[PDB]
Design a protein around this ligand. Structure first.
Ligand code: HEM
Ligand code: HEM
Ligand SMILES: C[C@]12CC[C@H](O)CC1=CC[C@@H]1[C@@H]2CC[C@]2(C)C(c3cccnc3)=CC[C@@H]12
Ligand SMILES: C[C@]12CC[C@H](O)CC1=CC[C@@H]1[C@@H]2CC[C@]2(C)C(c3cccnc3)=CC[C@@H]12
Ligand SMILES: [Cl-]
Lengths: 470, 465
């Protein structure tokens, strides 16, 4: 009782069956017309299970979470993460669980005396909004001005620093990062046939180059932090990891079987950094896009902000319960352009089963989040940006419209930075829309909504201007 | 400009206008009939503003949260909290912000390496379900299960079944709950603490028991402390206290006195016991009154967890019916029907009416959660209020729903309460059905008003399934 499979050849597998012009997620969606909502294929030696139904997905992620909690190893992700010593791409282990806890706790604990990431997010939203007022005349494209704000929130979190406006070594970070996003967990020949390392591989060479840069900047932050370290303060996530590593070397019963080598410390912090930039910036950019496209959504948000916050005061995180239309718009942005249309593979750790079907140990289960959030059977008009999907009868609050909505995934490997991302999206969006309304420059056209595919689904460059008032 | 007001005399105020056999929350809800959804009174010298409308409540707690973030000083709470060095009754200050964050962090970080508050909740759930598999022959068993969660979180210990220290703490706690933040007369008129007042004698006594037990735990922790471990919330506060003494320049405004550390840990302990136990006891009551709800939870458990493994926290999104049931329990019997006063730190306004600096704004959580304008058949227990159309997931039925409060003074242990309620109810109902001894009637739902509306004891006996 195995699920339908694509045709397989012996070494190759099903690769001859999966050449298309569509991006991998819509391709795997359209394949449901032939193979149903749940089906397998073979990428070289490795068996893939593609999951398009949310009942199956919640069975993978929740019911049988630890079971499908394995991560696959891959040459690109092995390099990115020093052979899986991060959190995503790290195999289900007490090491993975511990590092998740440390990131969680460092976020709860950031800012020593009353100060928190709320302060940092508000500082950076403020600094940005004051550059947008000061350049309403001279257009100035937000996006990079927004990317710096987001990067600074997570930069504060991880290394207790920030990038100056117009900083040289920031744009170098953006550049190497985009290089990594280009070349990592896109299924390429070396990721399918690892022995192709014996030949020259172009994208492996540029990936390795971007990693070298990152590794330089990480080691620089690492050794600085070590010299200036004190037990009286936990400045940032890196201090909390250094404290933990110290305890590991003092032999406490706690952290004895938990990986806290130098590698682990660096990859964890590096990971949170890269995540915090590429995920939140991407999501905000989609927000910006769908707001330019749907100015009646801009206005209804602004009218809400006028009612519950506006004038005399800027939006605070205590306002979180009280701005349901803004909340719903963010839900809808996450739903319509999922940040990862194909989730990282959930590898089967033992033999198990998914809804009537058998699932062989070691199989790579790929949840098709696109198909979950765009299924016409659970979402009406799936290409329509309607924040009302997530509102209650009156607009007093939110309703889950569908069981299929898994914006931060679920279960055991649920997004580590969910709470953070919610703070950033809420605060940045509310701060901007409080004072500004977003428009397209002169009589230019509305942005293209088809996404540059990868590990993250990112939009094509907008160039969008902010004109007061709101 | 000023809101309606009950008649007040000098000195006593509106007392004696407000004599009643009604519980205070209900009494104030019915006064709406004459004064409307928002009205003031005078309790002795101090001005109360009763808020019954969710729009007004949200303006108090959210839109103007920092303005109305003051707490009143009261001779009972003062004794309970060493003159406001805890969190709940601490005045709005950087100290308050800092102790909240500390508690959040210690909760996030609990018990490094192979230990999480999930595993502790699950452990105590297992202990309780082993004892309930002495089937056909509860209450105090669930109380101790709950106590062990917050006991590990705060002190890294536990009460075994039978400990004298455990019953010892339950009785001093009850004495404290029967006396604090009730309008004693000595609270209304603080000067008559120069007389024999027997409610202060019950307090002080219950408090010296408590402080003996805190200082033992504190001195034991001090003598076993290490900088490499962090065992619990108390270690966290000791670490902060040390760094503060070493002139960490950020934790300077904040107070990390011996008193601050003791009042914070003691509060989290008290809170974790009384609030979670009360809410779980109400759950049990309503489940006994509604066994078809029990059955619908049980069939959800079977078809989304199964029978070979026990409930895990990772099932958070996957049991809508049970979570909607918990919402309705929190709705129909608020843990604090009347809430601690939100004192105005400066002159302000609440929906057109003016509000005087110093006035003590009391949110009537009962009237928010039983307003016929916003809830249909408010005394009807129905978890389907919180379900969506297809029952696939949750859905907000009213903006009047504020079970953990909102804004700046929002509940500190909300995350902890949700873990506790979710796991214990799931663990229990996966293996049992709650019936009563067949020669009994369905339990009293009226309950005892104090700082935490607690139901009256009822001797339940859960059958296996
Ligand atoms: C802004 C919107 C975001 C969305 C919609 C989102 C969504 C998700 C999703 C769907 C997953 C996959 C879970 C799985 O494979 O089962 C995930 C994983 C992850 N997210 Fe996010 N995320 C976001 C932001 C962030 C941020 C800001 C961080 C910052 C650190 C972060 C850290 C992670 C990590 C570490 C994982 C891997 C967890 C693990 O393997 O245990 N995410 N996220
Ligand atoms: C089980 C159900 C619980 C409910 C329904 C509940 C509800 C509430 C409410 C309504 C408030 C007042 C919020 C406000 O004034 O805006 C509050 C405050 C508080 N709760 Fe809870 N609570 C629960 C459990 C807990 C637990 C387990 C703790 C454990 C530490 C806790 C600790 C607190 C504290 C410290 C405050 C005071 C916050 C402050 O003054 O800043 N609660 N809770
Ligand atoms: C490659 C990149 C982004 C480019 C950075 O230079 C390196 C990096 C580190 C961790 C990656 C991240 C992209 C998003 C990833 C893949 C992911 C993620 C994806 C979606 C939501 N939340 C988290 C967790 C790890 C994250
Ligand atoms: C008096 C008592 C309960 C009796 C204990 O012996 C001492 C104690 C400590 C703090 C109090 C708590 C009852 C509930 C209180 C009043 C409160 C609370 C109330 C409702 C929801 N969440 C928290 C936080 C402080 C809590
Ligand atoms: Cl949200």
């Amino acid at each position: 009782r195995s699920p339908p499979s694509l045709p397989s050849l012996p070494i190759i597998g099903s690769l001859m069956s999966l050449v298309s012009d569509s991006p991998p997620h819509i391709f795997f969606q359209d394949l449901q017309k032939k193979y149903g909502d749940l089906y397998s294929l073979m990428m070289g030696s490795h068996k893939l299970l593609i999951v398009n139904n949310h009942h199956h997905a919640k069975e993978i992620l929740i019911k049988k979470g630890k079971i499908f909690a394995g991560r696959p190893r891959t040459v690109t992700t092995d390099l990115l993460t020093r052979d899986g010593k991060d959190i995503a791409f790290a195999d289900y282990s007490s090491t993975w669980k511990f590092h998740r806890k440390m990131v969680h706790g460092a976020l709860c604990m950031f800012g020593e005396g009353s100060v928190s990431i709320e302060k940092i997010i508000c500082r950076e939203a403020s600094s940005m909004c004051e550059v947008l007022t000061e350049s309403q005349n001279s257009a100035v494209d937000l996006g990079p001005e927004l990317t710096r704000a987001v990067t600074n929130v997570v930069c504060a979190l991880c290394f207790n620093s920030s990038y100056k406006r117009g900083d040289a070594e920031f744009e170098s970070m953006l550049q190497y990062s985009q290089g990594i996003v280009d070349t990592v967990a896109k299924d390429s020949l070396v990721d399918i046939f690892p022995w192709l390392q014996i030949f020259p591989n172009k994208d492996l060479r540029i990936l390795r180059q971007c990693i070298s840069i990152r590794d330089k900047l990480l080691q620089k932050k690492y050794e600085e932090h070590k010299v200036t370290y004190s037990d009286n303060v936990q400045r940032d996530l890196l201090d909390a990891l250094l404290r933990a590593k110290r305890s590991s070397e003092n032999n406490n019963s706690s952290t004895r079987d938990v990986g806290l080598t130098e590698d682990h410390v660096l990859m964890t912090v590096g990971e949170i950094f890269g995540a915090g930039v590429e995920t939140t910036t991407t999501t905000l950019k989609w927000s910006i896009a769908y707001l330019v496209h749907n100015p009646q959504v801009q206005r209804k948000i602004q009218e809400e902000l006028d009612s519950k916050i506006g004038k005399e005061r800027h939006p605070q995180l205590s306002d979180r319960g009280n701005l349901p239309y803004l909340e719903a718009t963010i839900c809808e942005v996450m739903r319509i352009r999922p940040v990862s249309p194909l989730l990282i593979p959930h590898v089967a750790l033992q033999d198990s089963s998914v809804g009537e079907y058998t699932v062989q140990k070691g199989t790579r289960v790929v949840i098709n989040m696109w198909s979950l959030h765009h299924d016409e059977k659970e979402w009406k008009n799936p290409e329509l940006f309607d924040p009302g999907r997530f509102l209650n009868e009156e607009g007093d609050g939110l309703c889950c419209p569908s069981g299929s909505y898994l914006p931060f995934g679920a279960g055991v490997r649920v997004c580590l930075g969910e709470a953070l991302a919610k703070m950033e999206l809420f605060l940045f969006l509310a701060w901007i829309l409080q004072r500004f309304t977003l428009e397209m420059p002169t009589g230019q056209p509305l942005p293209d909504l088809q996404g540059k595919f990868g590990v993250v689904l990112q939009p094509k460059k907008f160039k969008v201007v902010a004109k007061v008032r709101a």
